[PDB]
Every structure is written in structure tokens, then in C-alpha cells.
Amino acid sequence: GIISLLDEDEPQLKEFALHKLNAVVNDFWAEISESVDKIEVLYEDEGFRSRQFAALVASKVFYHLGAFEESLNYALGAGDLFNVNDNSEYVETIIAKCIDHYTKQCVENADLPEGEKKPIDQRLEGIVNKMFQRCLDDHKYKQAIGIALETRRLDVFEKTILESNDVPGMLAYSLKLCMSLMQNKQFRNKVLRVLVKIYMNLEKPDFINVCQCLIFLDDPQAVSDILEKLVKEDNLLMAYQICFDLYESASQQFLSSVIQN
Amino acid sequence: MSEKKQPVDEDNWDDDNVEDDFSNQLRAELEKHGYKMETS
Amino acid sequence: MYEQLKGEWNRKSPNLSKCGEELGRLKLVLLELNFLPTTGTKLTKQQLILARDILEIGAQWSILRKDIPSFERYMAQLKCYYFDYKEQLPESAYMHQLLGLNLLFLLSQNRVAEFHTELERLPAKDIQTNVYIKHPVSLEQYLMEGSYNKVFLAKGNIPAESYTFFIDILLDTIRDEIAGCIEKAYEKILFTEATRILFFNTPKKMTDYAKKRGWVLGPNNYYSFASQQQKPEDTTIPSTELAKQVIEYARQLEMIV
Amino acid sequence: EPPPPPAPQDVEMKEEAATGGGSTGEADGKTAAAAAEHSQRELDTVTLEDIKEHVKQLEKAVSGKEPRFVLRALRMLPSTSRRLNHYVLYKAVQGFFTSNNATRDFLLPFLEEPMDTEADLQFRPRTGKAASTPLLPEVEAYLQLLVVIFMMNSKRYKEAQKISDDLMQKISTQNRRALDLVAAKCYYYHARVYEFLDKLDVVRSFLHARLRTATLRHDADGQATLLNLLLRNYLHYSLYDQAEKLVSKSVFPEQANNNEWARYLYYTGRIKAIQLEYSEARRTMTNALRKAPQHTAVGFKQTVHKLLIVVELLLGEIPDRLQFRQPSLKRSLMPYFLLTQAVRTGNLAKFNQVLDQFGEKFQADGTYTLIIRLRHNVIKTGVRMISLSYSRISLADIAQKLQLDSPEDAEFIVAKAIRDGVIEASINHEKGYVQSKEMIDIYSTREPQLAFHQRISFCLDIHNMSVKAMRFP
């Protein structure tokens, strides 16, 4: 229609044409479906300035059609002109699909020995902590922990417990939540032990943390090291209740083996 | 549910079938076929 | 405003002088308004009427240079000037025979959905005015009920020589349908019927057609033989593959309990 | 004046008692994507309100429901059910007390009243009814002067209900579908407000944007209600929007209401009429014809049939309309029995007399693409009738019996017939013979056994439709 006009070699008709496109885009969504190859060619022209805005409007039209996934790749390759917008229905559907791609990416990559991972692109992982900044602005903790488990990784999950005024009650039934949900033992126990790390970062000397990971992640040396903390501490409440918890709620082999340690 | 654009915009009823052969054709039928005896 | 760019209105293009000036001036229009996604104050639409007429002469220069995608692109531009959201525009002399030219190329290009949106984009005014609509749509009727009888006789009535260029394309869709519809569908025809319908009475053009059938001629005759061989039957392959359809019929017995 | 106080007190209270009190149960029946047993019932009574005795049809005292049910439009702890019972006892403002009319004058602060009363406790079809049923049963006043924007303001508070619909209750409202049903009918009232005088320039890009908000995420019945808007207003106001579909053609998952699916198939078949694709069109317009058996006795099924069967006449063959003739249709002469009478003839003078004499009714046809090839259909009907009658015929018979003035014009007609495959003829291009003939083997050797995969594919798909029917209870 008004898109075949681009046979000129100068790009200013192309910028005038996109100035027409975003103006009268509200009635002509089928015409770009024939201009898909022209979108590809104008995208693969580097020094031509409007490859990125072509990627924007291509995400728009392929969001109208149903090619949401090349809309997603075009949103990635649509420059900072894409990331400057995060307030719309369009943008919330496509960041839902974007961190959908990110979470299937992370669940795939999470079981790989030390590497050989697929390239997690920087845009889809930067909008992760941008949405965590939106969580901090909204001040909401459980939405922040939902996003913190969307990544299935300790990066922003570490940052939710790195916040200020994190009530250890909510952070402690977060352990309950993650106990009843996470399927593999590949990183559920890792979430457990990083929470007992952050509870050793808590100023009160915590023992519900070691009380739980001692009977799940079954550490024979951590009970000995908190016993050396008992040797330092010299209380009588210190050697009593966690002792009873492991003493009626651990393995028969476990305490009878570790008692000599 | 009935409208949606449209409110703005035995007899001979079975005999109509061969009456389509009676109206355009054969109205002086045995006035020519009855005269096939003596026309030739 | 640009006082008059068409100072050589009857001296359109003996060169590409005003064609380069036309690229520059259409680019000046592109710089100034942008196109017509604007409400307009109707004085910026006066140079849009000038833009209509210089895109008419740009269509004439595009058929002068034979750049048909730029021709039909400027033609789609002029149709968008008639798809322009204000009908309240001044009137040009070519206002309907541009639709006539669009109709004629649109019929020559073998697009019949484009033919019916041509008879549907502005339906009611196509019947009476502009005999360069009625003579093409009754010429479509002549293609419907009696073609190869009125083509040259219709070329004999175009006083406005811009329609013979596109009924040369219609002569091409005449000659290919000769090449598909006088041999390899009949029995035999003699040389004088091909001499009448295939004009100039022995070019390498009707010789090109006679050999384009994949066939060798004799003297003073054109047989249309050696076709539809073997009486084909497709021996037992549907018997096999429709049992391979009965396979997923058993799968339809499977998917239900 | 004593008989018109009992009746609205009865019927309007049986409306909203059932409506509100059952929609409460329908939205506290935590999951219901199908149930909606008072939603479609209230739609069956609001289409009946358009027959019946409106919100108030200025019913001979003051028209008082309009200063009644939108005041204190607040559904608190169930003493507001007693507020609605106070709106039952207060129905005799017309007969007992001082009569105040507040239609068309104080309805605008009444349109401000569902917000001026306290927070909506997640029952929007009561407020959707309060944004539709005041002024859209006042479209039947037909004045449409300075109340066009008033009815449009009632639909602006419908747009406030879309704000509270898909900008509020972010956990699975499921009256989103009921409000799709209500919003569809009030989009046809957007039609009945703008399209009386303008087009819906709001709802052009908002037709596409309401398709956007009901594309995949909460799309149920919204898709083809909006697509019937998309495929109905985009017929009179022009075309290639049907070609704007052709790269994003998407229909329902499951077929909807039978009338809805029927008229939708009718719209797309009528679009394929101007596309001149005659293969899919005949079966989908037959489906649409038999699938809408319920119509008002003034007609509208003969309307749908009238504008249906024209391309079926243009097929080259069509059954006789001796199964559709209606007397008011006989007086209105809508599909012209005389036209298909002349189709069965090879007559030209009476057929073009139908044309020239009845161009006044061709105005109501508006489908003038019929004639320029329907004359061709007349001459093809003649040659089809003759060549189907005769085994062998020559040009000397038919080329001058149908006065084609020449052998070769009938040779071109038979050439286009063989190009259509209708006749199996041959032309002796030596003496001037059509040495016509007929093909052989009309026996059931190879053809019906291959057509039985269509027959039995039909059968097994109806088996699977029976299976999916079995799947719902």
C-alpha cells in the first residue's frame, strides 16, 4: 500500500514512511504480511537507521497475526527503543511471553554440569531486574519472590533477601512454600542452604535454619560446628531444642553416626 | 438474538414444477399436435 | 505554494528533466506535509490536488519509462487520493479515466478480485459517466460472451491513447490463450484460420505459436493430434492408499474407547 | 390508568430478582465458563424487553424506574437487597406520591450515580445492565436528536464498565464472558447510534482494539461478535477488509450460538458472492439458510434467502424457488420469481425487461455484478439445456437457433463450455460441423467408490461430533 514506496536509496523516505506507519497503523495490519521480506531486508541493513523501528512495528504486526515469537526476537533486536516502553497492555503481554522464554531457558539450562548453556540474552535478563526494580518501587515482597523464583536462580532470589525490612517470618514460611513445591533436589536444597546462609547473616544466632537443613540437606559437620558454637556459647537452652528436633526427627543412622563426630 | 442487521433491511405451489413447462411452453399443445393429422 | 511546476504541461518529458524535478518536487511534498494522514486546513490540500495531478503525470512518465510497479504504485497512491478521507476535493480532468486506466491494467493483469473491488470501491458512478469505464466493462462482457471478435474493433475506439498500451497486454493474454485454445484441444485446423486469427499471415510469431504447442506442422494444415495418451487409469494405487486412510479410520476406532 | 401499575412491578421484579440474585450465585460459584443461567436468560428477557414494556415506556404516569434503581446503586451487606425491596415499594411514585420524571434530563447525574454510590462489590452485569438498559430501550423513541450523544454517554459508562472489567478484578472474573455478551449487543447499539448518522470512528480502531483485548487471553464469544461487526459494517463502508482478514483469519474454537454461527456463515458467504468463488459459497450459504429457522413473521429469512440465492442463480444451475414463496414476499418481489422463471427459459426480451423494468428493485439488490454475466448465464443455460438434451448437435442448429449470427461465436461458446468442461464436444474445422459427442462409462466403476471417502469422511466426522457431544455432561 504505502509500503512499496521505499525503492529510493535515501533513508529519509523510509523515516517518513514509518512516520506514516505508526500514524495510520490503526487500519492496515494485513499489508505488512506481504512486506515481511521487506521487513527482513530493512532489518538486515546496518547503517540504515530504521532497522530497529522496523523491528518494533514488525513485533506489532506479528503480535496482531500470531507470530509472537519472532515478535519476541524482534523486541530483543529492536534496540533501546523497545526497552524504553514498559507501560501498556501490548508490553505486558509480550514481557509475559519474554520471561516465559527466559524461564523455559533457565529450567533448561539449570541442569547442565558446569556450562555449555544456551545464550541467555542480555535484554531478557535485564528486564528481570528491571521488573525487580518495579517490585521494589511497588515495595511488594511476594511478587518479588515470585519473580525471584521465575528465574529459578539465586541472582534476584538473593536480592529479595538482600532488601531492607525483610521480616524473617515471611522469609521463614518462604522456606515452607519452597519446601512443598520445588520438584528436583538439584536446587531445592540449594535454595534451602542459601537461606540458612542468609539466616546466618541474620543478627540473631539462628537455629531453625540449621534445624531444617540438618535433616534435609543432612550435614554431619554443620551439627558439629554449631556444637562448637555451643562450646563457645555456654548456655543450656543452646543444646536442648534443636537436639530434640534431630533426636526424634532425624534418621536413626544419622545422629548415632554423627554423635562420635 | 434474532436480528443483528435485518430489521433495517393442495394448491398450485407444488404444481409450479411442471407449470414451469406450462407457462413458457405448450399452451396450444393439442391445437398443433391435434392438427398433425391434417397439416401433413 | 510553488507557482507552477508544470510550466511545460504539453511538453511533459522529451527528457528526464522534469522527471528529476518531479522526484525533487514529490520529495518536497514528502518534506512538507508528509502525505495525507492529516486533517488539513484545505490550503495545504491545494498542493495535495497539485500532488494528485503531478502524480497523474508521474504515472504518465512511469508508463513513458515502463516502470509498472512504480506505475501501479503511483496508481495506488492516486487511489489513496480517492481513498483520501475527505471527499471534499477539487476536480481534475482525469478523475474517472484514471479509474479507467486502473481498470484496464487491472483486467489485463488477470486479477478478478481486483476487478470486483474495482466495480465495488465506487460502484454507483461507474455505469453512466466515463465511457472509458463502460467500454471496458462491456469489453469484459465481450471477453465473457464472444471474445476474439471485438478486440481490434475496441482498439478502433480509444481517442485517448493510453489504453492501447494496456490492451497490448490484453493482446498478450489473447495470444497465450490462442496458444492454449486453438490447438491441443481440437482435432485439426487449416492454415487460413490461423491466418485470420493469428495476424500478419506468416510471422515467426504464429510460427512461434505452432512450435510452442510442441508440434510440427505440415503444408497448409495444423493438426492438433498426439494428445491424451494411454487412456490412463491409476491401476491399484487408490486401493492401497485408501486402505492407508482406513488405517487412521482404525485410529478413529482407537481414540474413542 | 389502573391496569399499567401492576404489570411492570411484576415483570421487572421477576427480571432483576432472578438476574441479580442468581448472578450473585453465578459469581460465587467460583468457576463457571459455561453455566451463566441467568445471563442468557436476562438476554432472552431483554430481547423480549425490546418487544415488551421497557425500563419504562413512559407508561402513562411519569416513567419512574429511572429515578429509582440507580440511586443507591450499592450492593452492601444484604440490607441493600432491602434497598431493592424499597425500590419495589417505591414503584408507586406514579400512583401514590408526587410524580417526578427524570428521563433524558437527570439521567446524566444518574449515569454518574453508580460511581457516586459506593464501591462495586464485583457484580458488574447489574451495572452493565444499568449502563445499557436505560437508554438503549430508548433507541425505540427513534428521535436520535441530542440523545445520540446521550445513548453514547450510556455506552461511555459501558466503557467505564470495560475499565472495571479488564482493568479491575485481576483474578478470573468469568463474568468477563457475560459482559462480552452484553458489550456485543451494546456494540450493536453503537451501530444503532453512530450508523444512523455517522460511522464508528471510535470503534474502528476500538473494534480492532476490542479484538485485541479479546484475541486470546479472554476470548470467548467476543471474537465472532466483533467479527460480525467487522464483517457487517465493513460491507457498506467498503471492502478489502475481508482481504485484511486473509492473513489473520481466525474463527471460534467451538461453534457458538446457532443463530450467531448461522448468520456469520451467511456474512462470509455473501462476501464470497462478490469474490465469485461459487464452490464453498453454495454449501456455506445452504448451511446458513437451513441453520436460521427462527425469524419474525414480517420475514428476514426471506431477506437472507433473497440476498442468498443470487449467486446460486449465477451458478448455471439452481432449484426452483417453489419452496420459499411467501405472500408478503410475493408483494415485495424481493428475489423475483420472474427472474428464475426467465432463467429456466432461453428468453432475452423478458429477461432484459426484468432488468430494465426492475432496476428500481435492483436498487434494493445492489448486486449489479449479477447481470453482466447473468446474461452470459442465460446463453450458457440455453446451450447447456440444448447440449444436455441432444447427443450430437451441430452449429447449423444451435449457432443460428439461438441467433449467434455465425458458427464461430457458438464455437467460442462451446470452447468456453469445454473450458468449463460442461460439454464433451468436438468441432470439425473443415466443413462447418460441430461433430459433437458424449463420453462413456457413466457406470459406478471408479467414481462412487472414491466419492465414498467424502461420504464416509462425512459419516466419521459426524461420529466424532456425536463423541464430542457425548463429552459435555
Short mmCIF file of C-alpha atoms in Angstrom, two decimals, chain D residues 55-371:
data_model
loop_
_atom_site.label_atom_id
_atom_site.label_comp_id
_atom_site.label_asym_id
_atom_site.label_seq_id
_atom_site.Cartn_x
_atom_site.Cartn_y
_atom_site.Cartn_z
CA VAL D 55 -37.43 0.11 31.55
CA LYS D 56 -40.39 2.50 31.42
CA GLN D 57 -42.17 3.09 28.09
CA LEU D 58 -43.30 6.47 29.51
CA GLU D 59 -46.11 4.33 30.84
CA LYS D 60 -48.81 6.96 31.38
CA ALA D 61 -47.79 8.47 34.65
CA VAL D 62 -44.19 9.57 34.98
CA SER D 63 -41.71 6.83 33.84
CA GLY D 64 -40.29 6.32 37.33
CA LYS D 65 -37.88 3.34 37.29
CA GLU D 66 -35.15 5.69 36.01
CA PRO D 67 -35.15 7.82 39.24
CA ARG D 68 -35.38 4.57 41.21
CA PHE D 69 -32.86 1.77 40.62
CA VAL D 70 -29.63 3.70 40.00
CA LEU D 71 -29.96 5.77 43.16
CA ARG D 72 -28.07 3.99 45.96
CA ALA D 73 -26.62 1.64 43.35
CA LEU D 74 -24.59 -0.05 46.05
CA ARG D 75 -24.75 -3.75 46.90
CA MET D 76 -23.62 -3.86 50.53
CA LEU D 77 -24.45 -6.25 53.36
CA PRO D 78 -27.89 -7.67 52.36
CA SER D 79 -29.90 -4.72 53.65
CA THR D 80 -29.30 -3.39 50.13
CA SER D 81 -31.49 -6.24 48.96
CA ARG D 82 -33.98 -4.44 51.20
CA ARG D 83 -32.98 -1.26 49.34
CA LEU D 84 -34.13 -3.01 46.17
CA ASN D 85 -37.29 -4.01 48.06
CA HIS D 86 -37.67 -0.31 48.87
CA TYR D 87 -37.35 0.15 45.10
CA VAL D 88 -40.24 -2.33 44.86
CA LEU D 89 -42.40 -0.41 47.36
CA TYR D 90 -41.42 2.91 45.73
CA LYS D 91 -42.74 1.79 42.33
CA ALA D 92 -45.95 3.67 43.21
CA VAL D 93 -44.36 7.11 43.00
CA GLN D 94 -46.54 7.11 39.85
CA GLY D 95 -49.76 6.37 41.76
CA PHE D 96 -49.34 7.29 45.44
CA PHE D 97 -46.76 10.06 45.73
CA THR D 98 -45.60 13.12 43.80
CA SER D 99 -44.66 12.05 40.28
CA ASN D 100 -41.13 13.10 39.20
CA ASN D 101 -39.87 12.30 35.70
CA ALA D 102 -36.10 12.13 35.39
CA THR D 103 -35.65 10.58 31.96
CA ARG D 104 -33.35 12.43 29.49
CA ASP D 105 -32.78 15.31 31.95
CA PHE D 106 -31.48 13.85 35.21
CA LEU D 107 -30.27 10.59 33.66
CA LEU D 108 -26.81 12.15 33.26
CA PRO D 109 -26.26 12.51 37.04
CA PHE D 110 -27.95 9.11 37.18
CA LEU D 111 -25.25 8.00 34.77
CA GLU D 112 -22.87 9.49 37.35
CA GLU D 113 -24.66 7.67 40.22
CA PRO D 114 -23.18 4.10 40.01
CA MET D 115 -19.86 5.83 40.76
CA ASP D 116 -21.47 8.34 43.17
CA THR D 117 -22.66 5.33 45.17
CA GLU D 118 -20.05 3.23 46.91
CA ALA D 119 -17.69 0.57 45.63
CA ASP D 120 -18.93 -2.10 43.23
CA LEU D 121 -18.65 -5.42 45.03
CA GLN D 122 -17.68 -7.38 41.88
CA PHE D 123 -21.12 -7.62 40.26
CA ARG D 124 -20.75 -5.71 37.03
CA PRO D 125 -23.72 -7.13 34.98
CA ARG D 126 -26.01 -5.21 37.33
CA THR D 127 -24.05 -2.08 36.43
CA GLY D 128 -23.68 -3.26 32.83
CA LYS D 129 -27.46 -3.52 32.75
CA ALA D 130 -27.55 -0.06 34.34
CA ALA D 131 -25.28 1.21 31.53
CA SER D 132 -27.29 -0.44 28.73
CA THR D 133 -30.99 -0.84 29.66
CA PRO D 134 -31.72 2.87 30.49
CA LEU D 135 -31.18 4.44 27.07
CA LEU D 136 -30.83 1.54 24.62
CA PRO D 137 -34.52 0.65 25.12
CA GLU D 138 -34.98 4.37 24.41
CA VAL D 139 -33.50 3.94 20.91
CA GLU D 140 -37.09 2.87 20.11
CA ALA D 141 -38.13 6.51 20.56
CA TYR D 142 -36.31 6.83 17.18
CA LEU D 143 -35.82 10.57 17.58
CA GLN D 144 -31.98 10.46 17.76
CA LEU D 145 -31.66 14.23 18.23
CA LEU D 146 -29.36 15.33 21.11
CA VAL D 147 -29.94 11.90 22.70
CA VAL D 148 -27.48 10.30 20.23
CA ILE D 149 -24.65 11.51 22.45
CA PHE D 150 -26.78 10.61 25.49
CA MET D 151 -27.06 6.97 24.43
CA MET D 152 -23.38 7.27 23.55
CA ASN D 153 -22.76 8.50 27.12
CA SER D 154 -24.55 5.41 28.43
CA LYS D 155 -22.08 3.46 26.32
CA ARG D 156 -19.28 5.62 27.76
CA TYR D 157 -20.33 4.28 31.15
CA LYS D 158 -20.27 0.90 29.45
CA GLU D 159 -16.66 1.79 28.66
CA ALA D 160 -16.29 2.55 32.35
CA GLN D 161 -17.60 -0.99 32.80
CA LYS D 162 -14.88 -2.19 30.42
CA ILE D 163 -12.43 -0.28 32.64
CA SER D 164 -13.81 -2.10 35.68
CA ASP D 165 -13.93 -5.33 33.61
CA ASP D 166 -10.46 -5.67 32.08
CA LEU D 167 -8.72 -3.13 34.31
CA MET D 168 -10.15 -4.49 37.60
CA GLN D 169 -10.66 -7.93 39.22
CA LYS D 170 -7.36 -9.44 38.11
CA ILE D 171 -8.26 -12.96 39.27
CA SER D 172 -10.62 -14.77 36.85
CA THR D 173 -13.83 -12.75 36.90
CA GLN D 174 -15.61 -15.04 34.34
CA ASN D 175 -18.43 -12.57 34.06
CA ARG D 176 -15.94 -11.16 31.57
CA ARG D 177 -17.69 -13.51 29.15
CA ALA D 178 -21.15 -12.34 30.25
CA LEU D 179 -20.01 -8.76 29.75
CA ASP D 180 -18.66 -9.77 26.34
CA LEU D 181 -22.24 -10.89 25.60
CA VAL D 182 -23.67 -7.61 26.92
CA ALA D 183 -20.99 -5.44 25.29
CA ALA D 184 -21.64 -7.15 21.96
CA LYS D 185 -25.30 -6.13 21.98
CA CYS D 186 -24.40 -2.62 23.04
CA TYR D 187 -21.83 -2.54 20.24
CA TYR D 188 -24.80 -3.16 18.00
CA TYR D 189 -26.30 -0.21 19.82
CA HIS D 190 -23.10 1.69 18.96
CA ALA D 191 -24.14 0.72 15.45
CA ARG D 192 -27.67 1.95 16.18
CA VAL D 193 -26.28 5.30 17.49
CA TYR D 194 -23.44 6.21 15.12
CA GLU D 195 -24.59 4.38 11.98
CA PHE D 196 -27.89 6.24 11.95
CA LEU D 197 -25.81 9.33 11.17
CA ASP D 198 -22.01 8.67 11.19
CA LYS D 199 -19.56 5.79 11.35
CA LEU D 200 -17.95 4.36 14.46
CA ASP D 201 -14.59 6.09 14.22
CA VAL D 202 -14.11 5.33 17.91
CA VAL D 203 -14.95 1.70 17.33
CA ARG D 204 -12.99 1.29 14.12
CA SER D 205 -9.66 1.18 15.90
CA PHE D 206 -11.61 0.22 19.01
CA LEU D 207 -13.15 -2.67 17.07
CA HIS D 208 -9.61 -3.78 16.40
CA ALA D 209 -8.59 -2.94 19.99
CA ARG D 210 -11.57 -4.77 21.47
CA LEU D 211 -10.49 -7.65 19.31
CA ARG D 212 -7.04 -7.07 20.82
CA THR D 213 -8.35 -7.30 24.39
CA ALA D 214 -10.34 -10.40 23.36
CA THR D 215 -7.94 -12.11 20.96
CA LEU D 216 -6.55 -14.97 23.01
CA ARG D 217 -6.29 -14.10 26.68
CA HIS D 218 -10.02 -13.83 27.50
CA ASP D 219 -11.59 -14.55 24.11
CA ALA D 220 -14.94 -16.34 24.27
CA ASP D 221 -17.90 -15.20 22.06
CA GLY D 222 -16.21 -11.83 21.72
CA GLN D 223 -14.25 -12.93 18.65
CA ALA D 224 -17.12 -13.56 16.30
CA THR D 225 -19.43 -10.93 17.75
CA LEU D 226 -16.71 -8.40 16.94
CA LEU D 227 -16.07 -10.24 13.69
CA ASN D 228 -19.73 -9.89 12.75
CA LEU D 229 -19.30 -6.16 13.36
CA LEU D 230 -16.06 -6.39 11.34
CA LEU D 231 -17.80 -8.31 8.58
CA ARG D 232 -21.04 -6.31 8.58
CA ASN D 233 -20.19 -2.61 8.83
CA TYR D 234 -17.28 -3.32 6.50
CA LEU D 235 -19.71 -4.26 3.74
CA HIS D 236 -21.47 -0.92 3.13
CA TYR D 237 -18.44 1.13 4.14
CA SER D 238 -16.09 -0.60 1.64
CA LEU D 239 -14.09 -3.80 1.17
CA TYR D 240 -10.57 -5.41 1.18
CA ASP D 241 -11.10 -5.58 4.95
CA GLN D 242 -12.28 -9.07 4.14
CA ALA D 243 -8.88 -9.27 2.50
CA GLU D 244 -7.46 -7.74 5.68
CA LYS D 245 -8.76 -10.94 7.29
CA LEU D 246 -6.97 -13.17 4.79
CA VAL D 247 -3.59 -13.18 6.61
CA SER D 248 -5.12 -13.37 10.11
CA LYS D 249 -8.26 -15.44 9.53
CA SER D 250 -9.24 -16.86 12.90
CA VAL D 251 -12.60 -18.29 13.91
CA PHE D 252 -14.00 -19.74 17.16
CA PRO D 253 -12.59 -22.84 18.85
CA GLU D 254 -16.12 -24.15 19.34
CA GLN D 255 -19.11 -23.02 17.31
CA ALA D 256 -21.26 -20.54 19.24
CA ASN D 257 -24.99 -19.86 19.30
CA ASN D 258 -26.70 -21.46 16.33
CA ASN D 259 -28.21 -18.22 15.06
CA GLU D 260 -24.85 -16.49 15.58
CA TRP D 261 -22.82 -19.11 13.72
CA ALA D 262 -25.50 -19.26 11.01
CA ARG D 263 -25.53 -15.52 10.33
CA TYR D 264 -21.71 -15.40 10.50
CA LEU D 265 -21.50 -18.08 7.81
CA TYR D 266 -24.10 -16.05 5.90
CA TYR D 267 -21.93 -12.91 6.07
CA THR D 268 -18.82 -14.72 4.83
CA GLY D 269 -20.76 -16.45 2.07
CA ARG D 270 -22.19 -13.12 0.96
CA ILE D 271 -18.63 -11.82 0.84
CA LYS D 272 -17.65 -14.83 -1.27
CA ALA D 273 -20.55 -13.85 -3.55
CA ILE D 274 -18.67 -10.73 -4.68
CA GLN D 275 -15.47 -12.79 -4.69
CA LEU D 276 -17.23 -15.05 -7.26
CA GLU D 277 -15.98 -18.23 -5.59
CA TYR D 278 -19.00 -20.45 -6.10
CA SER D 279 -17.82 -23.75 -4.57
CA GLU D 280 -17.54 -23.06 -0.84
CA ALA D 281 -20.28 -20.44 -1.08
CA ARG D 282 -23.14 -22.75 -2.05
CA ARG D 283 -22.64 -25.10 0.88
CA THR D 284 -21.96 -22.38 3.46
CA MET D 285 -24.97 -20.34 2.34
CA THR D 286 -27.07 -23.51 2.38
CA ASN D 287 -25.83 -24.15 5.93
CA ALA D 288 -26.69 -20.56 6.84
CA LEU D 289 -30.10 -20.87 5.17
CA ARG D 290 -31.21 -24.01 6.96
CA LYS D 291 -29.42 -23.07 10.19
CA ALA D 292 -31.56 -19.98 10.98
CA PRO D 293 -35.18 -21.23 11.10
CA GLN D 294 -36.40 -18.58 13.55
CA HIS D 295 -37.40 -15.19 12.23
CA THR D 296 -40.10 -12.58 12.66
CA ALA D 297 -43.28 -13.16 10.61
CA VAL D 298 -42.59 -9.97 8.64
CA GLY D 299 -39.76 -12.00 7.08
CA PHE D 300 -35.95 -11.75 7.35
CA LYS D 301 -35.44 -15.37 6.43
CA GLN D 302 -36.75 -14.46 3.02
CA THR D 303 -34.38 -11.49 3.25
CA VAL D 304 -31.47 -13.83 3.98
CA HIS D 305 -32.67 -16.15 1.20
CA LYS D 306 -33.25 -13.30 -1.29
CA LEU D 307 -29.74 -11.96 -0.94
CA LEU D 308 -28.50 -15.56 -0.69
CA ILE D 309 -29.64 -17.27 -3.86
CA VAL D 310 -28.49 -14.71 -6.43
CA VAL D 311 -25.08 -16.28 -6.95
CA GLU D 312 -26.83 -19.64 -6.78
CA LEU D 313 -28.71 -18.43 -9.85
CA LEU D 314 -25.27 -17.37 -11.15
CA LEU D 315 -24.02 -20.97 -10.74
CA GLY D 316 -25.52 -22.04 -14.04
CA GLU D 317 -28.00 -24.23 -12.16
CA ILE D 318 -30.36 -23.72 -9.22
CA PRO D 319 -33.54 -25.45 -7.98
CA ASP D 320 -36.92 -23.81 -8.29
CA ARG D 321 -37.93 -21.39 -5.53
CA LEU D 322 -41.34 -23.11 -5.16
CA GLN D 323 -40.29 -23.95 -1.58
CA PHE D 324 -39.62 -20.36 -0.44
CA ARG D 325 -42.51 -18.28 -1.82
CA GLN D 326 -44.16 -16.11 0.85
CA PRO D 327 -47.16 -13.79 0.23
CA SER D 328 -45.62 -10.63 1.72
CA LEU D 329 -42.50 -11.73 -0.16
CA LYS D 330 -44.78 -12.01 -3.20
CA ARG D 331 -45.88 -8.39 -2.76
CA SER D 332 -42.33 -7.19 -2.06
CA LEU D 333 -40.95 -9.22 -5.07
CA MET D 334 -37.57 -9.44 -3.36
CA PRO D 335 -35.80 -12.33 -5.26
CA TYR D 336 -38.10 -12.07 -8.32
CA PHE D 337 -39.75 -15.42 -9.10
CA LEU D 338 -39.94 -13.96 -12.63
CA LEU D 339 -36.11 -13.82 -12.70
CA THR D 340 -35.66 -17.53 -12.05
CA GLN D 341 -38.62 -18.14 -14.34
CA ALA D 342 -36.61 -16.44 -17.09
CA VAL D 343 -33.56 -18.46 -16.02
CA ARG D 344 -35.42 -21.64 -17.00
CA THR D 345 -36.21 -20.02 -20.35
CA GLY D 346 -33.74 -19.03 -23.02
CA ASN D 347 -35.61 -15.74 -23.30
CA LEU D 348 -33.86 -12.41 -23.77
CA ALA D 349 -36.65 -9.85 -24.20
CA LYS D 350 -38.44 -10.67 -20.95
CA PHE D 351 -35.15 -11.18 -19.06
CA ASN D 352 -33.84 -7.79 -20.10
CA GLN D 353 -37.34 -6.43 -19.39
CA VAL D 354 -36.86 -7.70 -15.82
CA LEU D 355 -33.51 -5.88 -15.89
CA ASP D 356 -34.63 -2.53 -17.34
CA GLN D 357 -38.15 -2.50 -15.86
CA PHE D 358 -36.97 -3.65 -12.42
CA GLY D 359 -33.80 -1.62 -11.98
CA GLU D 360 -35.86 0.13 -9.29
CA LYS D 361 -35.76 -3.16 -7.37
CA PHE D 362 -32.18 -3.77 -8.48
CA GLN D 363 -31.57 -0.70 -6.32
CA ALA D 364 -32.55 -2.86 -3.35
CA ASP D 365 -30.48 -5.66 -4.87
CA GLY D 366 -27.32 -3.56 -5.12
CA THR D 367 -25.55 -6.58 -6.62
CA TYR D 368 -25.32 -5.40 -10.26
CA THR D 369 -22.43 -7.83 -10.80
CA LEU D 370 -25.20 -10.37 -11.36
CA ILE D 371 -26.37 -9.09 -14.73
#
